Design a protein around this ligand. Structure first.
Ligand code: HEM
Length: 152
């Protein structure tokens, strides 16, 4: 279920994300590349990247736009870490286009893991981060399952 974060945990999340927030596009490009390189089956899910060698598409605007849009959502989630309804809305709106996409929870969770590994967080910030991410996926999966209105 959704579990609100304390004011202290909210600060921990903001601080944990700070490095990435300060280099959002750069981080996005690297993480997305590492994600598709470690879990190559996922490249085909992105119709614009499908059929090309990963090292070939990594430098294209298209690849960068995708990585950027993904991280922009996470950035806005962190922005709303202190407002559950707002946090939920960011995810609800983004969930729509994924509902009809043939993507497994494994794929989504693997991306979560690549992001976590890149942050190298200590356990205090990690706990707060995982609380926010658990909320992220609770909302995201509820929405993919057709139960997004509960957050309205
Ligand atoms: C859970 C973290 C994710 C976030 C925050 C996120 C966010 C977004 C956003 C904002 C868009 C653009 C609007 C649209 O839906 O067209 C998008 C598009 C898309 N996403 Fe995600 N996404 C995530 C994970 C994934 C995963 C794990 C996959 C599958 C490997 C995936 C596949 C796609 C595809 C195929 C598109 C559209 C293709 C395109 O625009 O060229 N996404 N995503």
């Amino acid at each position: 279920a959704f579990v609100g974060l304390s004011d202290s945990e909210e600060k921990l999340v903001r601080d944990a994300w700070a490095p990435i927030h300060g280099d959002l596009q750069g981080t996005a490009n690297t993480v997305f590349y590492n994600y598709l390189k470690k879990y190559p089956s996922n490249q085909d899910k992105f119709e614009t990247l499908k059929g090309h060698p990963l090292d070939e598409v990594k430098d294209t605007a298209n690849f960068k736009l995708i990585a950027g849009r993904i991280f922009t959502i996470f950035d806005n989630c962190v922005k709303n870490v202190g407002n559950d309804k707002g946090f939920q809305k960011v995810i609800a709106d983004m969930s729509g286009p994924h509902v009809a996409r043939p993507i497994t929870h494994g794929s989504y969770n693997d991306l979560r893991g690549v992001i976590y590994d890149s942050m190298h967080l200590d356990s205090t910030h990690g706990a707060a981060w995982n609380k926010m991410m658990d909320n992220f996926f609770y909302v995201f999966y509820e929405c993919l399952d057709g139960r997004c209105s509960q957050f309205s």
